[PDB]
Swiss-Prot record, chain A:
It comes from Severe acute respiratory syndrome coronavirus 2 (2019-nCoV). This is 3C-like proteinase nsp5. The lineage of its organism: Viruses, Riboviria, Orthornavirae, Pisuviricota, Pisoniviricetes. Residues 1-301 form the Peptidase C30 domain. The active site is at residues 41, 145. The chain holds residues 3264 to 3564 of 7096 of the full protein. The gene is rep. Cleaves the C-terminus of replicase polyprotein at 11 sites. Recognizes substrates containing the core sequence [ILMVF]-Q-|-[SGACN]. Cleaves and inactivates human TRMT1, preventing tRNA guanine(26)-dimethylation of tRNAs. May cleave human NLRP1 in lung epithelial cells, thereby activating the NLRP1 inflammasome pathway. May cleave human GSDMD, triggering alternative GSDME-mediated epithelial cell death upon activation of the NLRP1 inflammasome, which may enhance the release interleukins 1B, 6, 16 and 18. Also able to bind an ADP-ribose-1''-phosphate (ADRP).
Length: 301, 304
């Protein structure tokens, strides 16, 4: 018993963090083999910040304009190229601490750990979900530009996120490691705001399944609902619509507990319309939406 | 501002991951911490499930020799060359100093203080979380199976301060353990006897620190124009299962009071009203709950 949110152990990623400086701009970089990956906006001046022509500005940078520091060791930049919004700096030394890794793109609702860094130095690690509006909850004190998000499967680090900007609403926005933004954001200094956020329904259902596996069953009811009737109610509460894909993903939890997904949906519907009525689920008075069905299957099954 | 949407973070766990090993005595396997040439682990590794009701640790340990302990670091077996018990911790001297030993210290913490736990199974790190030692001396730990020997720590400028080692799971799912000198936190024993955590309370000084952080960040909706005496606040707070606030706690909040221009007792009156009204929809620093696992030490440092 005891369902606590956990980040992946961050050691494998800590070994990859470096400091990248271009002129007056300093941020974090990820050093894998002989390449350092970082946000392409490291090359921006205040003059450039509004409507920059990145590829044109970059071909006019000499390698030595890039200062890469790994601890007390300076790495020499021998090449540079841009891949979407990510800058790739080829260095003269392969990182001896490079773990087994892959670059993956995640979907909103999926979870990962972020190793928050400042000036190439790891500060802390936290677990989070990509929100349905493609932002990540977090402050200026939860890491700066170039900090990365990842999952670990067996001994392999799957890098899924790189922080590009902190928005004014206490959330950050960024890209995958191939430089493709998550969400309708751009790497320019312009008025950009996160869209209205919604609750990740499939994760709340996974969390209710976690509560059942842990013997917290007070909210279970005898009813079922259709997927359409549930979605009609859920959307009135700013919950994401549930898809057949989400129903399929919850399949193993349904089979393990003997509670069909649309049976658990009827429990959630009752919780939304009537509240918790002075009760808790897994010791919490609020419904948790940053645990995926896989996080539940991994921690307790 | 700086803390809008603040998320609690654990310390980067790399320096501790390099210290985790698997310790086996007969049929019992758990985690050990390898620092220099010593492996630290719960002394109950020498117990069977049967021994756990009434273990006589001195009698069980005298019967062991160095060769009864199997220590594995990855795929490498470490040779045990000595063993001694220090309170509830077993110390195994090994023939190899850990080359990954970080700069470290052993410290004993107080209830309300925070630390990170690197949850491990069979000497392998599984996850990391941030927590506080509860006022009832327990920790709200992971779902679990074989995490005994997993440790709690803080990191200050590349020095790891080890403050906790997991020993037991209590019937309420919470965890109990010791410091790295083997002294239990709370009135618990490394024995499978009827042991129950006392009623847990909210860490008031941490909630107040969080409210000051919210004010520094321009989130002021919960403030009121009242002040309270320290005793009137404690009379109300205790009705809500909040820890009583002491003059030490009032002193600790001093720099936050000076930075915001809000006297501690003035913030106390605001908390008293929050407890009365509740946070039904509203958020503070982007969170729907009153946070009690963020200390004044960290708020003062993050809000210079």
């Amino acid at each position: 018993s005891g369902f606590r949110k956990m980040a992946f152990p961050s050691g494998k990623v800590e070994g990859c963090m470096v400091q990248v400086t271009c002129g007056t701009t300093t941020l974090n970089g990820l050093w894998l083999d002989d390449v350092v990956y970082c946000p392409r906006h490291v090359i921006c001046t205040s003059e450039d910040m509004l409507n920059p022509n990145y590829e044109d500005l970059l071909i006019r940078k000499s390698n030595h304009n890039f200062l890469v520091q790994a601890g007390n060791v300076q790495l020499r930049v021998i090449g540079h190229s841009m891949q979407n919004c990510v800058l790739k700096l080829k260095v003269d030394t392969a990182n001896p601490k490079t773990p087994k890794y892959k670059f993956v793109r995640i979907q909103p609702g999926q979870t990962f750990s972020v190793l928050a860094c400042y000036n190439g130095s790891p500060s802390g690690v936290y677990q989070c979900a990509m929100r349905p509006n493609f932002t990540i909850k977090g402050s200026f004190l939860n890491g700066s530009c170039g900090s990365v998000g990842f999952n670990i499967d067996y001994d392999c680090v799957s890098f899924c996120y790189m922080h590009h900007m902190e928005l004014p609403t206490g959330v950050h926005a960024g890209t995958d490691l191939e430089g493709n933004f998550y969400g309708p954001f751009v790497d320019r200094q312009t008025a950009q705001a996160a869209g209205t956020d919604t609750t990740i329904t499939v994760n709340v259902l996974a969390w209710l399944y976690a509560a059942v596996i842990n013997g917290d069953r007070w909210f279970l009811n005898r009813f079922t609902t259709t997927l359409n009737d549930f979605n009609l109610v859920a959307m009135k509460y700013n919950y994401e619509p549930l898809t057949q894909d989400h129903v399929d993903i919850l399949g193993p939890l349904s089979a393990q507990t003997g509670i069909a997904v649309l049976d658990m949906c009827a429990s959630l519907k009752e919780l939304l319309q009537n509240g918790m009525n002075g009760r808790t689920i897994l010791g919490s008075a609020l419904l948790e939406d940053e645990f995926t069905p896989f996080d539940v299957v991994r921690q307790c099954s």
